[PDB]
Enzyme design. Sequence first.
Site, PDB file in Angstrom:
ATOM      1  N   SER A   1       0.831  -1.203   0.000  1.00 19.37           N
ATOM      2  CA  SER A   1       0.000   0.000   0.000  1.00 19.37           C
ATOM      3  C   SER A   1       0.868   1.256   0.000  1.00 19.37           C
ATOM      4  O   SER A   1       0.463   2.293  -0.512  1.00 19.37           O
ATOM      5  CB  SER A   1      -0.958   0.021   1.201  1.00 19.37           C
ATOM      6  OG  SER A   1      -0.308   0.340   2.416  1.00 19.37           O
TER       7      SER A   1
ATOM      8  N   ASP B   1       7.605   1.998   5.689  1.00 16.72           N
ATOM      9  CA  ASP B   1       7.139   1.525   4.386  1.00 16.72           C
ATOM     10  C   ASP B   1       7.258   2.556   3.262  1.00 16.72           C
ATOM     11  O   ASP B   1       7.864   2.294   2.222  1.00 16.72           O
ATOM     12  CB  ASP B   1       5.679   1.085   4.475  1.00 16.72           C
ATOM     13  CG  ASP B   1       5.474  -0.044   5.448  1.00 16.72           C
ATOM     14  OD1 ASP B   1       4.431  -0.065   6.125  1.00 16.72           O
ATOM     15  OD2 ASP B   1       6.357  -0.913   5.531  1.00 16.72           O
TER      16      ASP B   1
END
Lengths: 378, 378
Positions: free
Chosen positions: A130, A188
């Site tokens: 994501s 991330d």
Amino acid sequence: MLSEVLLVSAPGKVILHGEHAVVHGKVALAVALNLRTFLVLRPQSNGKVSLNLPNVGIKQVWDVATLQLLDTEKLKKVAGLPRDCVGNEGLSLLAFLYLYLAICRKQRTLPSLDIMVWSELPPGAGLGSSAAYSVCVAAALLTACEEVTNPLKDRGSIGSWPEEDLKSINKWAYEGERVIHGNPSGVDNSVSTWGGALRYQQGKMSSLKRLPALQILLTNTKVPRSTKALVAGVRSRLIKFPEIMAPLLTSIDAISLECERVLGEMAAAPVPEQYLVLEELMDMNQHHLNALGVGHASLDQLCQVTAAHGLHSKLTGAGGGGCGITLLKPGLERAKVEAAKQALTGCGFDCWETSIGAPGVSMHSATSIEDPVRQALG
Amino acid sequence: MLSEVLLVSAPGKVILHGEHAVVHGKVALAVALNLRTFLVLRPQSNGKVSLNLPNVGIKQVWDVATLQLLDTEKLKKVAGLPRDCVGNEGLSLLAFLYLYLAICRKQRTLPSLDIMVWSELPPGAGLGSSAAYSVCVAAALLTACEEVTNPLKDRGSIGSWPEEDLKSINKWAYEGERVIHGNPSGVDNSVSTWGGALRYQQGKMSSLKRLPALQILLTNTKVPRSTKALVAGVRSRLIKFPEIMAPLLTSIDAISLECERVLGEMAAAPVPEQYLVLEELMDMNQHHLNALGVGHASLDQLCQVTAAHGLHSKLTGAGGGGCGITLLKPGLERAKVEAAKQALTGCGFDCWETSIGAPGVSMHSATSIEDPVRQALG
Ligand SMILES: Nc1ncnc2c1ncn2[C@@H]1O[C@H](COP(=O)(O)OP(=O)(O)OP(=O)(O)O)[C@@H](O)[C@H]1O
Ligand SMILES: Nc1ncnc2c1ncn2[C@@H]1O[C@H](COP(=O)(O)OP(=O)(O)OP(=O)(O)O)[C@@H](O)[C@H]1O
Ligand SMILES: [Mg+2]
Ligand SMILES: [Mg+2]
């Protein structure tokens, strides 16, 4: 606003060392996984913005007219623009819209675009797909609205943004992760933007200066797991056997630190004895994790088959299933590695032969794009 | 001197927790293994002492006349009494003689005996069979020359010696281990004498007061190994990765200490949740040992098969082969355990279903002796 078609790609991530230890203050090493996510943005005439997500089999179309007439927490209100239905991946279409308005607002007319997203990353397997998606989105929009330089302004093959620009991409990529995750750390998206390797201690991150070429085998066991559960059991065992667990965590911390030191000394001249240290580190981190209690039969199996072929692996992430990593040093025989993949697949696991310490956000000319990717994109 | 036939038996040992950690100052737990060594001593008329060791297929006969005329370091001289030939187990016949003369010297005439030794213990597998042997020998002689009370003086079924007497048995059992090993610590012979469980820190030993009933599966992989090698590799890795290894050792130390605490609380009333702690301790100690580097494919295999049946195991001793232990808590289904044994055997391993925390030096009436043992003894 630019006119040309934009093609950007961003890598996912894997925790080399540190997994559960980070929750307790220890150092962790996150690295860019070369399983990329691609996003093709095409300018359009019709007053419509279309986001197309093949993977999650969903397409959404909005008309600039309606959105252009919308008064510009905030989330609830945003949901009142498209709708509010099923989908754990419905938040993504919400993350696209947020990134679309907030970034193009300074334009005197919301552009008409067409976004095509397709990644090689398995969703939910902990490889941060994501963020790779948010990074790709923030990067395409930012470049289209010329809020950032155009890497391929000189008509190059492959290109990247300058530091100051990568920072803007990350900041926006982060908001998009906030909407879909709520309280993301930023590892991330930072890994997806800058690529390479990242060091995460206790809220502070840094970018390892230089990394060597590392080949690995990414294995997905497809075994479902509960990340919230694993972390709870670890904390549980930390409370039950404190004098046993405390030292163990410190041991894992030392593994991240040691790896950091070696990778740096490998960036100089990669001596064969350097790959020996790395696989010893993986072996030990895998045993420690089994000790923590986050192991799984599918993972012992992954390591067992792999060792049978002289390869070294360790789980990656939450444990109790998910993915695992196997190192492929310079010198192995095409046969040893090729059999491992077959064996792994027979167990019913997905297996990829890719690389770690990947590039990061990149703009590609439609001729730099492979065939499989080009087929899925156009 | 007594006249009746003496029948004594002594248990071997297994390291529950502590294995390589003891070399570095950490606590270790040694326990009596119920795989016993029996020794039948028969008084004789002929001026001959015969030591018969079926296992090692060797018998030796001496005549009291010659030995009675021998002038009573010291070793070299002792070898000049019988001979000096082949046999790693030749030192044993030397350990018998030493124990024979030194203990019967205060007699006005060296007795004519006949010793029969037969154990269920596999030699060299690290279960301390030579101490079990020394203990049996020192115990039979000491009782024959009435240097110690006669447990079965009241014609009982099974009996033991009093504390003050067990101490004499150990002291002599130790000299016998000195001759065959050179520099033994005293854990083996102390475990064989007192039975039960022993705590070994840094030269100091203690006897855990009370232990619960523990059933286990002893597995011998028959894989040969180098104890000197294993310990060297561990020290090697301790030097290479000090911040990683140091904590690990401390973790293992905590496992021995924790086990010590629980076993003590189990001696009260063994609640089912107490066996859960024990198997968690074994699981963790096994992973730590793999981390130390003393693991082996035959051992991962032993644990893999065992876990498949819901049982928990860990290697025991030097690692890199040798034996392993599997816990059998109260409540398992005869089927789970019975299949494990078959599987283990198929791998080509020897498997015994015995107990830990065994009795210790004991005198048995020839009717207390089972059939297999009685057959091998007479
Ligand atoms: N190719 C893709 N196209 C659109 N959305 C994607 C894609 N890949 C991932 N996503 C979105 O990201 C979300 C993934 O959430 P998830 O908790 O599984 O995090 P992850 O990014 O898969 O990895 P990790 O949790 O380690 O970060 C899904 O809700 C999905 O909507
Ligand atoms: N039943 C037996 N009869 C005669 N001698 C025995 C018997 N069992 C063991 N021994 C003697 O003891 C010696 C065993 O030496 P070893 O280094 O293998 O120690 P171990 O006692 O087998 O176990 P560990 O080394 O853990 O103590 C052999 O040299 C052998 O002569
Ligand atoms: Mg993510
Ligand atoms: Mg011994």
